[PDB]
Ligand binder design. Structure first.
Ligand SMILES: Nc1ncnc2c1ncn2[C@@H]1O[C@H](COP(=O)(O)O)[C@@H](O)[C@H]1O
Ligand SMILES: Nc1ncnc2c1ncn2[C@@H]1O[C@H](COP(=O)(O)O)[C@@H](O)[C@H]1O
Lengths: 288, 277
């Protein structure tokens, strides 16, 4: 075990350091909570931190790691926002005791060798045109789960397809961790918080309310059925200046090879200028 | 509740959750959990892994018996052998219990899996590493035991453990051999007398190579080839000298010589440590 100062933020870069500290905490009865992030923290991330915090006896580990493996080449990785000083300041303000900030060399010392191959869900929606993205996510999350060995791991409903795929990972590899989904944090007007929102200029920011407005319109229209819900969403998106829809799909909640019934998830992705935004919402069909 | 466990007796569990719960409970009581993965049909080769696991102070030995459909049966007899060895846990899951959602998330091995045995069987090691990762997470052993017999499998499991940051020690156990050197395998019984006599060439070629190695890598390889060449009906699939991690052989130093061959319809493998010079 390296130094651990309780009630203070401890920052570890070495996998072995955080693994030792986590083990030592776990052996003395603390329950270790893990919150994977790519940094540039905002209130969406803090909702996961707080959910973790409220677990009785919890120690909270927030990982910050802009994982190269889930980026496709073409400057996306270099372009990802990095604000380490603000991130650690926020974690201190939240009472988090552990930040895990690994280097690329420590996570990938052998490059890409053994990796996780996700199931067919990874080839759809976000994965359609980024066929390796979710292998990247599931590989790093598996590694983080093995390094930290948390009792529970926290993921946002914001990245709902990611959340579902993490549940598949946990189920399919018999991982002894509880996956906790945390509801999407929104701005006052409905805009889902994201580190990419900083790339919307004033006009795009105004137009971007249409994604959440479309989804919530759809959620309410859904008493009248799937077609009514989808066409409500399309009408709002269509009314929105310079929103280019990539997809809008209503699926069963597991997003799996199962047709939609009473409970679904409506998912949208759209481009505003160069910024790709995502949102999703629970949908109940024929239910008021 | 935790499932029943009778110390000193063979306790058999088919449900992953059950062996998981028992393993956890035992870990907490001051046992070190040892895992020995098999596909049943046990012989002295498997028993050497068992005995290596047993000798670890405070060990409780978990032997898994599971025929993994993804890398492609004497149940009562296997179980009696384990009882005889003083094994306390056998984990005998069904395919449905191991794969309740079918094949979905899997492990994708690195490029070593496309080589050597990955030649004729390109999907084989994905199946192995997928099932071994699952057994590791179910049982959560302190140490997991594999035979040097399947050396490429062993090296790939070390890669799995390293790459996924798994907290388990991987223990390789030396190949158990018949009196004439042939590596023990359930496949040996398929050989007719001519083929069984010819089959001694694999181990003879490797051991010759090991001793020829004082004269350098080429002398070792040529020695092995000459012994394989003295045997009838032995179709060599490969004969390769690699470093101990199965990368390219270094100029001198330690390596591994691996061989595979087909005798009629039966495919046999063997391998040996080589020290160059
Ligand atoms: N607005 C939000 N509400 C809830 N969770 C979020 C939000 N934005 C990001 N997250 C979650 O925080 C984790 C890290 O997000 P990221 O750093 O963007 O990869 C993921 O589990 C996200 O789903
Ligand atoms: N002759 C042998 N000597 C040492 N280990 C062996 C031998 N035969 C099989 N094993 C090991 O026993 C384990 C189970 O093999 P199997 O049941 O063939 O999957 C593997 O780790 C094998 O490498």
């Amino acid at each position: 075990i390296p130094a651990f100062h309780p009630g203070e933020l401890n920052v570890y870069s070495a996998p072995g350091d955080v693994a030792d500290v986590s083990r030592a905490l776990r052996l003395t009865g603390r329950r270790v909570m893990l919150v994977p992030t790519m940094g540039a923290l905002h209130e969406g991330h803090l909702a996961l931190v707080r959910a973790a915090k409220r677990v009785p006896g919890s120690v909270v580990v927030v990982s910050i790691f802009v994982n190269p493996m889930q980026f496709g080449a073409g400057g996306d990785l270099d372009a990802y926002p990095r604000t380490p000083d603000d991130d650690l300041a926020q974690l201190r303000a939240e009472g988090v005791e552990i930040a895990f900030t690994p280097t690329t060399a420590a996570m990938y010392p052998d490059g890409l060798r053994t990796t996780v191959q996700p199931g067919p869900l990874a080839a759809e929606l976000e994965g359609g045109p980024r066929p390796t993205h979710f292998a990247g996510v599931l590989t790093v999350v598996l590694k983080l789960l093995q390094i930290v060995r948390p009792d529970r791991v926290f993921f946002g409903e914001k990245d709902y397809q990611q959340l579902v795929l993490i549940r598949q990972l946990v189920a399919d590899f018999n991982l002894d961790v509880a996956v906790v989904g945390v509801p999407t944090v929104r701005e006052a007007d409905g805009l889902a918080m994201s580190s990419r929102n900083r790339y919307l200029d004033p006009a795009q920011r105004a137009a971007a309310v249409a994604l959440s407005a479309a989804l919530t319109a759809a959620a309410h229209a859904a008493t009248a059925g799937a077609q009514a819900a989808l066409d409500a969403a399309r009408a709002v998106l269509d009314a929105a200046p310079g929103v280019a829809v990539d997809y809008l799909e209503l699926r069963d909640i597991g997003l799996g090879p199962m047709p939609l019934n009473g409970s679904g998830r409506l998912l949208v992705a759209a481009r505003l200028g160069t910024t790709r935004l995502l949102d999703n919402i629970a949908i109940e069909i024929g239910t008021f």
